[PDB]
Structures are given as structure tokens and as C-alpha cells.
Design an enzyme around this catalytic site. Structure first.
Site, PDB file in Angstrom:
ATOM      1  N   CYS A 122      67.880  49.655  39.386  1.00 33.05           N
ATOM      2  CA  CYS A 122      67.379  51.000  39.644  1.00 33.05           C
ATOM      3  C   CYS A 122      67.576  51.966  38.466  1.00 33.05           C
ATOM      4  O   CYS A 122      66.717  52.804  38.195  1.00 33.05           O
ATOM      5  CB  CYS A 122      68.075  51.526  40.874  1.00 33.05           C
ATOM      6  SG  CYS A 122      69.860  51.495  40.906  1.00 33.05           S
ATOM      7  N   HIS A 166      73.274  53.872  43.365  1.00 33.26           N
ATOM      8  CA  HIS A 166      71.800  53.824  43.428  1.00 33.26           C
ATOM      9  C   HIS A 166      71.276  54.970  42.576  1.00 33.26           C
ATOM     10  O   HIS A 166      71.977  55.912  42.351  1.00 33.26           O
ATOM     11  CB  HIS A 166      71.295  53.919  44.861  1.00 33.26           C
ATOM     12  CG  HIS A 166      69.824  53.699  44.994  1.00 33.26           C
ATOM     13  ND1 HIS A 166      69.182  52.578  44.493  1.00 33.26           N
ATOM     14  CD2 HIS A 166      68.867  54.452  45.589  1.00 33.26           C
ATOM     15  CE1 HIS A 166      67.881  52.668  44.761  1.00 33.26           C
ATOM     16  NE2 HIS A 166      67.670  53.791  45.436  1.00 33.26           N
ATOM     17  N   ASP A 189      61.923  57.185  44.766  1.00 34.45           N
ATOM     18  CA  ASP A 189      62.823  56.077  44.980  1.00 34.45           C
ATOM     19  C   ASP A 189      62.019  54.833  45.286  1.00 34.45           C
ATOM     20  O   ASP A 189      61.523  54.647  46.387  1.00 34.45           O
ATOM     21  CB  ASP A 189      63.815  56.340  46.147  1.00 34.45           C
ATOM     22  CG  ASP A 189      64.804  55.211  46.367  1.00 34.45           C
ATOM     23  OD1 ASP A 189      64.801  54.251  45.525  1.00 34.45           O
ATOM     24  OD2 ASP A 189      65.638  55.321  47.329  1.00 34.45           O
TER      25      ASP A 189
END
Length: 202
Positions: A28, A81, A97
Site C-alpha cells: 500500500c 495501512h 484506498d
């Protein structure tokens, strides 16, 4: 009923649609870096309106709901994250996201309500902190050699992205300095959940 104006409703996304974006599961930080690079490289929005947001805590165990890795039965407990935040001029922030089952992009208040949720009744060691780094600074400063994803036996935990590692003149690896929620370390500003929502929430 209750009603507010003025408002923001024809928002054009800052990125390509979800399925056209650069993406590797469990990278990520890099997925977000590549969104930042896209925005820099186009003339739609000023880079100054965009932020990389690392979500983590001291125990590196943070729940996030509405996640593609476990739909319907959240949360997923991540070590960290990373998402992209765009503060648009229309009165309104958006979260990008690639790992959410919420829309891509999603209104900030929706993402906080449905993916993040309250910390009030969450066991304290699982509560969320937020490191918010200006996109320009993230592109300038971030570096990862991916070595955190290669276990003892030299096997990859998840397949690495095919393009070269992100490196800078100053560092080949400083991921830990972005995962860290120590406000004395790294770049950007560290916020509690309440501070984060105060800053960006509508």
C-alpha cells in the site's frame, strides 16, 4: 430533514478508476506513492491538496473495516495501512484506498464512519493513529527496498511490484520512519483519531 450549502458534488477523481491504477497487494505504501506520482504528473489538481496517510499504532495492530481482504466480516487487522487523501476546494475531502470495498474514491466522512469507526470502545492497544505527509514530501523523501517483505528463508510474503524500488539520494529504506507514530520521527504530522477527524472531517 437537514440541509447545508454551498457544496461539492461534481467531484472529478484525481486518479484513474480503481482497476486502472498501479497496485500490488500488501504494498500500500507504494500503491499510494504511485497515486501521488500520477497526480504530480497531471494538471488536474495541485499536489499541495494531497496527502499520504499512514495508519498504525505502537503495537502495529490496527483494525480497518470495509476491506477487500475480508468483505462482510471486518475488521482486517493490519500492521499498517496507507491511503491517499485529497482535500478538494469544494468543501470536502476524499480518501483513495485501493484496498477498500467502499467507493474509490470515497468521501472522507464516509470512510471514517464505515472503515475506521470509533476508537471509544476499541481495546486501547488497537486504537488508530495517523501520520499525514504532504504528497510532495512523500515523493521527495520516501524510500523502500522491500526488505520487510522477505522472510528469514528469503521467500517473499507477497509478490513484490515489478518496477524498481523507490529510493532517494538520502535513503534506500526508511519505511519504518513512516510506520512509526512517534511524532519526533520522520516526516509529516502524527494525529490521534480525534485530531485527524477534526482536521479533515466535514
Amino acid at each position: 430533514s437537514e440541509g447545508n450549502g454551498p457544496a461539492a458534488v461534481h467531484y472529478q477523481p484525481a486518479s484513474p478508476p480503481r482497476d486502472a491504477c498501479v497496485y500490488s497487494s500488501c504494498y500500500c505504501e507504494e500503491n499510494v506513492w504511485k497515486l501521488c506520482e500520477y497526480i504530480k504528473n497531471h494538471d488536474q489538481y495541485p499536489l499541495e491538496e494531497c496527502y499520504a496517510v499512514f495508519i498504525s499504532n505502537e503495537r502495529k495492530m490496527i483494525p480497518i473495516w470495509k476491506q477487500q481482504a475480508r468483505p462482510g466480516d471486518g475488521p482486517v487487522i493490519w500492521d499498517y495501512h496507507v491511503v491517499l487523501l485529497h482535500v478538494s476546494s469544494g468543501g470536502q475531502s476524499f480518501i483513495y484506498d485501493l484496498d477498500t470495498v467502499l467507493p474509490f474514491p470515497c468521501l472522507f466522512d464516509t470512510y471514517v464512519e464505515d472503515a475506521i469507526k470509533s476508537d471509544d470502545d476499541i481495546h486501547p492497544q488497537f486504537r488508530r493513529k495517523f501520520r499525514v505527509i504532504c504528497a510532495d514530501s512523500y515523493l521527495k523523501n520516501f524510500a523502500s527496498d522491500r526488505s520487510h517483505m522477505k522472510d528469514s528463508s528469503g521467500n517473499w510474503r507477497e509478490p513484490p511490484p515489478p518496477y524498481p524500488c523507490i529510493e532517494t539520494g538520502d535513503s534506500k529504506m526508511n519505511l519504518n520512519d513512516f510506520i512509526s507514530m512517534d511524532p519526533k520521527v520522520g516526516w509529516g504530522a502524527v494525529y490521534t483519531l480525534s485530531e485527524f477527524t477534526h482536521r479533515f472531517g466535514s
